[PDB]
Amino acid sequence: NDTKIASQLGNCVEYSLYGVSGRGVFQNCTAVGVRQQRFVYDAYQNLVG
């Protein structure tokens, strides 16, 4: 009985991922390692993907 919000692709809708949160656009890009660490980050700790 819901809208199935597990993903959008995409614009800029706030998100929560296992208690990590922020707002942003998601897009279906390619993979980078390490796989299954879930959260990819840059040197400034911005989530990358």
Partner: protein
């Protein structure tokens, strides 16, 4: 309490002869930090091929480590004889905010038997056993390292494909060559390849039962088990402790070739560990069928900082210990 299974029937044990002078060998192994040796991967995050600074527990870069070698017990003819082992049971260590180890480092090469080194047998990977706890003291015969209350046990069982962890207590036995007996020398455990590790039925309790022959497990509160498969390629392993409890790390689960450690498992026990030791073990195989075992190494963690050169696949490929020298 945990169903460890029945108490072994005999209070008796196989005699343990200390042959420690046979085990003095010189094979130091300094950490090659530019290969990211001994690097524990950061928790819960990953990175691109960007280089970043980092702070965390690590082995000292110049440390060549502590080396230990497991060996076969005495045997003659076609049958087993009294055990021949190193005096490693007496090697009590203060816990030092965790440690890391190398397993199989000498694999796919040859060496010597060590205990009967003239045979010059080829060497192969063997999995180590350990014990951890909050206190130590004298054995009733004055031997070093008796433990108090409950201790962690990490024991491979049978072949290297089975691993078990425990968090219960141990009780001494009054049989010949056992801890409450006065014929006791030192604690050891053993495996017997003649019946243990059958090819169609590996003996899942083999090492555990030989452990039971020296100590009666009592009041056990935890047990865990894991599945492993054989691989002569080198593996890394280690243990750390935090206010969330003890954690287990290995390179095997994720990075078989690069060797970066990952947290494969965690443990419920947060009781502070103040002491650590390696459990001695021996092989009960026939003397003509005896095989040499690969060298095993241990290193201790410190609150060091490093450059980390992540790969685009996020494996750490190179690192710099800042304090090693002025160039670093």
């Amino acid at each position: 309490y945990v169903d460890v299974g029945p108490d072994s029937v005999k209070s008796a044990c196989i005699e343990v002869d200390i042959q420690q002078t046979f085990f003095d060998k010189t094979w130091p192994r300094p950490i090659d930090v530019s290969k990211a040796d001994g690097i524990i991967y950061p928790q819960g995050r990953t990175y691109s091929n960007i280089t970043i600074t980092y702070q965390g527990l690590f082995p000292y870069q110049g440390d060549h480590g502590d080396m230990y070698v497991y060996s076969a017990g005495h045997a003659t003819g076609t049958t087993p004889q009294k055990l021949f082992v190193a005096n490693y049971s007496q090697d009590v260590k203060q816990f030092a905010n965790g440690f890391v180890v190398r397993i199989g480092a000498a694999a796919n090469s040859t060496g010597t038997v060590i205990i009967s080194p003239s045979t010059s047998a080829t060497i192969r990977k063997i999995y180590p056993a350990f014990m951890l706890g909050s206190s130590v003291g004298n054995f009733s015969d004055g031997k070093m390292g008796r433990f108090f209350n409950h201790t962690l046990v990490l024991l491979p069982d049978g072949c290297g494909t089975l691993l078990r962890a425990f968090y219960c207590i141990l009780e001494p036995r009054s049989g010949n060559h056992c801890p409450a007996g006065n014929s006791y020398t030192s604690f050891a455990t053993y495996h017997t390849p003649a019946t243990d590790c059958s090819d169609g039925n590996y003996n899942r309790n083999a090492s555990l039962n030989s452990f039971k022959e020296y100590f009666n497990l009592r009041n056990c509160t935890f047990m865990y088990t894991y599945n492993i498969t054989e691989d002569e390629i080198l593996e890394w392993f280690g243990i750390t402790q935090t206010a969330q409890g003890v954690h287990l790390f290995s390179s095997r689960y994720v990075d078989l070739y690069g060797g970066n450690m990952f947290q494969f498992a965690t443990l419920p026990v947060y009781d502070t560990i103040k002491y650590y030791s390696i459990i001695p073990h021996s092989i009960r195989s026939i003397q003509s069928d005896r095989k040499a075992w690969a060298a095993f190494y241990v290193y201790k963690l410190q609150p060091l900082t490093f450059l980390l050169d992540f790969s685009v696949d996020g494996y750490i490929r190179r690192a710099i210990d800042c304090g090693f020298n002025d160039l670093s």
